[PDB]
Amino acid sequence: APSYRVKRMDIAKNDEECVVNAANPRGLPGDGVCKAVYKKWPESFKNSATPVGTAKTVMCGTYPVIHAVGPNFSNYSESEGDRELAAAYREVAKEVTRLGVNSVAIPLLSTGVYSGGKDRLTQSLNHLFTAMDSTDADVVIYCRDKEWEKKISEAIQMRT
């Protein structure tokens, strides 16, 4: 029976069969979540470029890294950002399904330096659920904040 779970830890130390990188559309290393991911799976950055609202898988040995590009809300309108954020999660669901994995480690896309300085915990998490509800993978959501951990945990709890 597939679960959602949340872990307050470095996604680069995930115990899942594949990882989602919070990527830039240029396929560049970056800083934060992308940094740790670059350090752990640097070969996965070969031709990792993919447009905003898309996801592209690059293998690191046999370990899949799914580079998912949420929108930078600084650059987008609220309505266009929302569309691109939903689309990115949909493409994650497709790659997870295509790869046949039993589990996936996923961050909340567009909630850090791409948030346009807004709290998008609820917006981003609900787009993740919409996409991942049609898959059979165990989903483990990674965050850093102690609060976010609690709010994500409660939103998981009150669907079950």
Say how many Å lie between the first and final Cα of the chain, rounded. Answer: 12
For ligand TJD, give the closer residue by CB, 37 or 137: 37
11 binds ligand TJD, rule: CB under 6 A: no
Supply the minimum distance, in Å, between the C-beta of residue 68 and ligand TJD.
6
12 binds ligand TJD, rule: CB under 6 A: no
Report strand pairing: 138-143 vs 4-8: parallel
C-alpha atoms less than 13 angstroms from C-alpha of 77 in its C-beta half-sphere? 3
Supply the minimum distance, in Å, between the C-beta of residue 56 and ligand TJD.
13
For ligand TJD, give the closer residue by CB, 27 or 107: 107
Map residues 40-69 to x or -, x wherever contact with ligand TJD holds by CB under 6 A. -----------------------------x
Binding region for ligand TJD (CB under 6 A): 22-24, 30, 32-34, 69-70, 107-115
